[PDB]
Amino acid sequence: NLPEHWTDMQLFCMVQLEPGQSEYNTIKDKFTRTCSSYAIEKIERIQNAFLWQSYQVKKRQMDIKNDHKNNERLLFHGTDADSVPYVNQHGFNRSCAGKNAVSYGKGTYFAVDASYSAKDTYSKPDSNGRKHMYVVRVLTGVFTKGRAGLVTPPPKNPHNPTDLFDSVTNNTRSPKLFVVFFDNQAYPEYLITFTA
């Protein structure tokens, strides 16, 4: 049930990408579009079979529920070096997320621009100057402007409270961040290690 472009594996692997290959170049270009002042050390493909299976089941469900296939975005997530081993194995856990400086809900935050996740607040430099940013497939689905009190996405309709938006954002006209409130709604696909 695994993608054909993964290396043959074991249930988990990190795969170092080669510059000049299209897969590496597309990630670098997306990163450099707004992060021209940093320099990438390496880009690794996260091959996590269990996280992939759970995420893809959730994506198929959202595609059915919403009756279209533009539920997924490729977003960024900066984090500290100490969180990287957990995210590689277990993904993003809302119960560990820090509070965002503009909070649109209690969940895991993903950024449209790498420049946002490049802030030392998120991708905290380690003692060797290395900063860490995931590139994440995120099931954003149908979204609305969040509120700091949210622990789940809000209902679309107050008289049917269990029929929920899939995620929330900071601005529905010009989205710069998305917040997801459920496990396996985000698959960490690449880990960018970079430096000033």
31 binds ligand 3JD (CB under 6 A): no
| Chosen residue from 3, 21, 61, 156 binding its own copies by CB under 8 A | 61
**Cβ contact 190:135 at 8 Å:** yes
38 binds ligand 3JD (CB under 6 A): no
For the CB of residue 92, give the shortest distance to its own copies in the complex, in Å: 12
Nearest to 171 by CA among 106, 76, 102: 102
DSSP symbol at 70: -
**Cβ contact 79:122 at 8 Å:** yes
70 binds its own copies (CB under 8 A): no
Helix, strand, coil in percent for the chain, rounding step 5:
25, 30, 45
Closer of 31 and 55 to its own copies (Cβ): 55
100 binds ligand 3JD (CB under 6 A): yes
Q: In the complex, which residues of this chain contact ligand 3JD (CB under 6 A)?
A: 76-78, 96-98, 100, 102, 109, 111, 116-117, 122, 177
